[PDB]
Design a protein around this nucleic acid. Sequence first.
DNA 1: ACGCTAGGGATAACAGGGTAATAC
DNA 2: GTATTACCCTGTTAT
DNA 3: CCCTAGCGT
Length: 223
Amino acid sequence: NIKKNQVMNLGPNSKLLKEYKSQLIELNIEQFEAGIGLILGDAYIRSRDEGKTYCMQFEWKNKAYMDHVCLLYDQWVLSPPHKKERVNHLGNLVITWGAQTFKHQAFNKLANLFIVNNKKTIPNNLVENYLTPMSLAYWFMDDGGKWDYNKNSTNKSIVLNTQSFTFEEVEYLVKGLRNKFQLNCYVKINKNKPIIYIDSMSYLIFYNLIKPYLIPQMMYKLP
DNA sequence: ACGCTAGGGATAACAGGGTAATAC
DNA sequence: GTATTACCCTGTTAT
DNA sequence: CCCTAGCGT
Ligand SMILES: [Ca+2]
Ligand SMILES: [Ca+2]
Ligand SMILES: [Ca+2]
Ligand code: NA
């Protein structure tokens, strides 16, 4: 059986590579559960072949987090993270890291959790039936943050930046978070867009749910 | 005065596109 | 040539 | 995502 070591440097259309590919069938449990939070978060899952296969693309400022994720998806990620340096329209140097898994049907299982009537979307009940505490940890490390950033502040309220989802979508997400994890939360408008507000009242419950999965370098997002 | 908020800005993300490296 | 496709790349903001 | 000006008390 081919070893990652043997194809991580071959051409994309290489036979040896495709063999290693066929030796893989499905994502392992962590890869799947964490996958939910990442897709809800900063990751990007795409298909270039009408749903035959999907790969996940990653891009983060924090290198530590990037390396944590690549390691989590180890067997699906051939190359180390690539450094991306660009200039804004303000002539400013912004640094980020990029990486991605190769495409594979193993990813269809994750992708599908977000397609209904044939469109990318957030299903009512995604939370209820699939979002595990691990899922929540990654969603938090990705789009989570504090409500009050003022220094010395004592507000424990939390926020999930869901500004790219529809209000109805976030509305469904909130229902699932309340019902499934008894989190005192609700939708709030920001720049005419939806974010999830998690009352400080439930901070400790929220915290105890994701605590096991967050890494040292993400601990700063917590109040 | 001080704690919230919502308003706001410069990213730190998300989305797609293009091609050098294999196959036949 | 034509078909593949992982690893960059740039377009653009919602975060 | 974070910051912070300035409303509300
Ligand atoms: Ca997001
Ligand atoms: Ca993030
Ligand atoms: Ca975005
Ligand atoms: Na994000």
